Amino acid sequence: LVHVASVEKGRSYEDFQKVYNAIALKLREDDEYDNYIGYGPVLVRLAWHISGTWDKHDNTGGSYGGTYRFKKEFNDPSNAGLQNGFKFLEPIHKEFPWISSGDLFSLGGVTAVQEMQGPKIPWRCGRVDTPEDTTPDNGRLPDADKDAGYVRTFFQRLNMNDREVVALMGAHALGKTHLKNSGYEGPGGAANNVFTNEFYLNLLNEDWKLEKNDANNEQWDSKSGYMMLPTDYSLIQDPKYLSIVKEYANDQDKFFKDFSKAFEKLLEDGITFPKDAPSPFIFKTLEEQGL
Numbered sequence: 001l002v003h004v005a006s007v008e009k010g011r012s013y014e015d016f017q018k019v020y021n022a023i024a025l026k027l028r029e030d031d032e033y034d035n036y037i038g039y040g041p042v043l044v045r046l047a048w049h050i051s052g053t054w055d056k057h058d059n060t061g062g063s064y065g066g067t068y069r070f071k072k073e074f075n076d077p078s079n080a081g082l083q084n085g086f087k088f089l090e091p092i093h094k095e096f097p098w099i100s101s102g103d104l105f106s107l108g109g110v111t112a113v114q115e116m117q118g119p120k121i122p123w124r125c126g127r128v129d130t131p132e133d134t135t136p137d138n139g140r141l142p143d144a145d146k147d148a149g150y151v152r153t154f155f156q157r158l159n160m161n162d163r164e165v166v167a168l169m170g171a172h173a174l175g176k177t178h179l180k181n182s183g184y185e186g187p188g189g190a191a192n193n194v195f196t197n198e199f200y201l202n203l204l205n206e207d208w209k210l211e212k213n214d215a216n217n218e219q220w221d222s223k224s225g226y227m228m229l230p231t232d233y234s235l236i237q238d239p240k241y242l243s244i245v246k247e248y249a250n251d252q253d254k255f256f257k258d259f260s261k262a263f264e265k266l267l268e269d270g271i272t273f274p275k276d277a278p279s280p281f282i283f284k285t286l287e288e289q290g291l
């Protein structure tokens, strides 16, 4: 199955920077969301979940088709809570009806990371909306009550290696888990709407205790009020993952560079870019634009 990137008719860098700006401005405006965490975190999760349905074996799923807009995927139990991100992007899509859903969902994630002071994430346009019959079935996203072995195997389907997996998980420093959405409760750190390498520092420096939350699920909690999912904790349980966790905890720049590459790769999995397609766009933040 092949998905060839097709640039929205006549659009260029400037058009997409305008969409980015609209998203960034709304992020700044609607600051009260989720007890003032803002929509940054949920937008990053949305971009990851619409991309995380991909299967390298047959190229089903993936961000290309923007299938999250269809009820089967929209209602995936694994996507509980993402409706908030979708609603946030609705007015954006209304103003820029020309951008495809896949491009909008993925751009939302890139915009969020950058506006939260994270690394620059090159982004490519061209995803094209596909029929409702192309929507992937539920169950392709990962479980959180598993171990390192599960995590490693799961991500091989997304063509991600150990380093890429550990780097991507760093996004768990963002936002929080919500009991009503996933059966887990609590943030991973203190700075939950600013993109940093705090995820790794906390895994290594906090004293975690295996407890049961009000949904009767086990999770690791610290006195500081932070939490880690069993899958997050597996990163310091597995010796190979542990080495990488230590690396990122001690090199903020390295983490930023590796996360950027892995996140762009995640958002582009399944897409074939023509040799003459535009080069990846690197959008300026509102701050860099003096906006």
Ligand code: HEM
Residues within 6 Å of the ligand: 041, 042, 044, 045, 048, 080, 081, 142, 143, 144, 145, 151, 168, 169, 171, 172, 174, 175, 176, 177, 178, 179, 180, 181, 182, 183, 184, 229, 231, 263
């Ligand atoms: C091992 C794979 C993964 C597991 C099992 C997992 C599990 C979870 C769970 C259970 C939540 C809480 C949802 C809620 O209650 O609202 C969550 C939130 C989150 N996830 Fe992951 N996740 C994984 C991978 C990733 C990756 C690769 C990224 C992005 C690079 C990511 C980004 C996020 C973000 C930003 C949030 C917070 C969302 C919010 O605050 O609304 N996760 N994840």
Ligand SMILES: Nc1cccc(N)n1
Residues within 6 Å of the ligand: 172, 173, 174, 175, 176, 177, 186, 187, 188, 189, 227, 228, 229, 232
């Ligand atoms: N904020 C957050 C989201 C998912 C997992 C963790 N540990 N923390």
